[PDB]
Design a protein around this nucleic acid. Structure first.
Ligand SMILES: [Ca+2]
Ligand SMILES: [Ca+2]
Length: 341
DNA sequence: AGGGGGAAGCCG
DNA sequence: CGGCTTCCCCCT
């Protein structure tokens, strides 16, 4: 199996630069403004000119502005980014049908029965890059390896505007030298738990008894990590099915008054419904509380949920959450549409 | 043994 | 911080 992973470089910011070539070479900070205060909210994506100063995704906007007070701060334009992305994805479909659209800016291609050699793979990666740059004016990073995980590692190593192959031998070396924290799917929580016990590299997870590993990080990731370190990850390209579409709004203040909350919830459902190209069979209401804790209550039907009962159902789920948590106020309210068609 | 449902984790 | 995905209870 030969897998080619495509990772659109600093996507949102880069789309902004394409829409405005006068931004290129300037710190660009694409943010999610929350509307509560001016400058409230978080950074969503920043270009390299910004991230070289610590201004990156996840940090509060006011921190960003503290570090880089003269950068170009732009609000999320997700509909645009998504149009561009759908075009690049369609573009990618010409090179393979076995394709997994992992997210808005990431996609996996099984080019196995379509190259037969890693040279062809590299060259095809250059072809893909040149095509994408030519048609959509954005640079991507291509990773190529023996599976999805190492393709992604390759991309991670070559960002931005890179191309990288990880042959079998380099896989062998990587199992031994690559930090657990750099393993795709492994975040800071898992990495910290493992780090506490001297588990630092992939091969390290072999040194510890399975039951103990599972006891630390859960069966799933334990099986995952181990299979990687044994170089037995054989997982195939699964075509899409990412059936979650969400929408979240921050309330004008914290409150338990459904009379205040429900309105914002409906608009959320509204904007959620037109973002999706199909019908959800399951709806979940999601409340972010005042202590930032999150409550979910959802319902699935054997049929599609029209927007008009999405309102009713979601109001029921909301009231239900307000019974479930009699203590805290709500700070943000949202919805997740699942099981789409 | 199995499929929800809801909380925990990842990562831009 | 925000929005998705993963995962692991939990109750037949
Ligand atoms: Ca990415
Ligand atoms: Ca990682």
């Amino acid at each position: 199996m030969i897998v080619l992973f495509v990772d659109f470089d600093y996507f949102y910011a880069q789309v902004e630069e394409v829409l405005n070539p006068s931004l290129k070479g300037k710190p660009v900070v694409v943010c999610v403004f929350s509307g509560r205060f001016e400058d409230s909210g978080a950074v969503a994506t920043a270009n390299y000119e910004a991230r070289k100063f610590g201004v990156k995704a996840g940090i509060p906007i006011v921190e960003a502005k503290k570090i880089l007070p003269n950068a170009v701060y732009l609000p999320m334009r997700k509909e645009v980014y998504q149009q561009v992305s759908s075009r690049i994805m369609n573009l990618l479909r010409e090179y393979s049908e076995k394709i997994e659209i992992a997210s808005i800016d990431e996609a996996y291609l099984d080019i196995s029965d379509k190259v037969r050699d890693y040279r062809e793979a590299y060259n095809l990666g250059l072809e893909i890059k040149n095509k994408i740059l030519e048609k959509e004016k954005i640079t991507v990073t291509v990773g190529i390896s023996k599976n999805k995980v190492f393709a992604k590692i390759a991309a991670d190593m070559a960002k931005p505007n890179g191309i990288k192959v990880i042959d079998d031998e380099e896989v062998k070396r990587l199992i031994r030298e690559l930090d657990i924290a750099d393993v795709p799917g492994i975040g800071n929580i898992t990495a910290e738990k493992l780090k506490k016990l001297g588990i630092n590299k992939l091969v390290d997870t072999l040194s510890i008894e399975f039951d103990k590993l599972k006891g630390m990080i859960g069966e799933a990731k334990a099986k995952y990590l181990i299979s990687l370190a044994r170089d037995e990850y054989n997982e195939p390209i699964r075509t899409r099915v990412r059936k979650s579409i969400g929408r979240y709004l921050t309330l004008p203040y914290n409150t338990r008054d459904v009379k205040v909350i429900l309105p914002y919830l409906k608009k959320a459902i509204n904007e959620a419904y037109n973002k999706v190209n199909g019908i959800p069979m399951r709806i979940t209401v999601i409340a972010i509380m005042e202590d930032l804790d999150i409550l979910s209550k959802g319902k699935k039907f054997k049929h599609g949920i029209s927007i008009d009962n999405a309102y009713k159902v979601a109001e029921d789920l909301l009231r239900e959450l307000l019974v479930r948590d009699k203590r805290r106020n709500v700070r943000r309210i949202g919805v997740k549409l699942d099981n789409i068609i």
